Amino acid sequence: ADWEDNMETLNDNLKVIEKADNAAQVKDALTKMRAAALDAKKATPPKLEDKSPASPEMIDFRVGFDILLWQIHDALCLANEGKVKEAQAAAEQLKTTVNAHWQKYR
Amino acid sequence: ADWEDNMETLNDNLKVIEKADNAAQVKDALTKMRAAALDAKKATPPKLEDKSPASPEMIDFRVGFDILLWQIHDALCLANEGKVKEAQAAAEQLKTTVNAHWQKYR
Amino acid sequence: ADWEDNMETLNDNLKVIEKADNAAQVKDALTKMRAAALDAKKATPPKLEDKSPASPEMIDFRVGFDILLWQIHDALCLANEGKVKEAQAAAEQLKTTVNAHWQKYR
Ligand SMILES: [Bi+3]
Ligand SMILES: [Cl-]
Ligand code: NA
Ligand code: NA
Helix, strand or coil: CCHHHHHHHHHHHHHHHHCCCCHHHHHHHHHHHHHHHHHHHCCCCHHHCCCCCCCHHHHHHHHHHHHHHHHHHHHHHHHHCCCHHHHHHHHHHHHHHHHHHHHHHC | CCHHHHHHHHHHHHHHHHCCCCHHHHHHHHHHHHHHHHHHCCCCCHHHCCCCCCCHHHHHHHHHHHHHHHHHHHHHHHHHCCCHHHHHHHHHHHHHHHHHHHHHHC | CCHHHHHHHHHHHHHHHHCCCCHHHHHHHHHHHHHHHHHHHCCCCHHHCCCCCCCHHHHHHHHHHHHHHHHHHHHHHHHHCCCHHHHHHHHHHHHHHHHHHHHHHC
16 A cells, blocks of 8 residues: 555544444544554655655654554543543544645645 | 753643642643653754754654653553542653653753 | 663563463563663664664664554553453564564564
């Protein structure tokens, strides 16, 4: 895959979380999002393909994926506590972050 | 924000945690600390401005913020479980680590 | 402590987790594992000693610690919740990750 496909996986699992019926489904979707966010952190997005891997721009990109990963980590804790609705609330902020990253790096 | 301002945010919120009366205040302060540590990962302390962004020294700096982030996450999980006093002890350890990073890079 | 020392610490604490009977023992071993993994993340492993610090190889090396750390903390949250055997299974997965990293970069 690639960065774009990782972003598509993030969006798909956000859609799954929105429609989820139980904590197991939210946990599964958030786990998939965690894996996808890491994989995207290892990629180079289209806008930064003219920048070096250790440029400040790419370092900041990887930190942005760290931010997304921490939002996922905390939402996953909230889901493992069984609070499905609050985990969906946190997934809303997840959606905001993912959209901003898509607009910034595509 | 620059590195010093992020460290100041960390210390202000440590003070907030020290004097908190409920889990909500602790959680708010810890969320602010997480945001500040992540933002500081994108900064450069003044004495490392001549180093390359991926130099061993800058790697040590960013990973120090990773250390802080996992300690913040511990305190946040404790707060989520209602364990305010354990979260405050964890925040005392966090204050020690923030001080050590400050002394190391200033 | 160099990278190899950190790997040996991770392996030792995995052995500790395997034979633990209570959650406090598991939590202690996992805390030590987090410390060792974050120490290793800032290192240059033996196989990559001839590579630039800005090389994509070192970036991938560091990003590979994201998985290790989030698996450590999956196990640690399970241990904080008192699920000893579940934490031990999570630590088995973590052991897979640790040994793969060790043998990849030595
Ligand atoms: Bi937790
Ligand atoms: Cl880097
Ligand atoms: Na609980
Ligand atoms: Na027994």
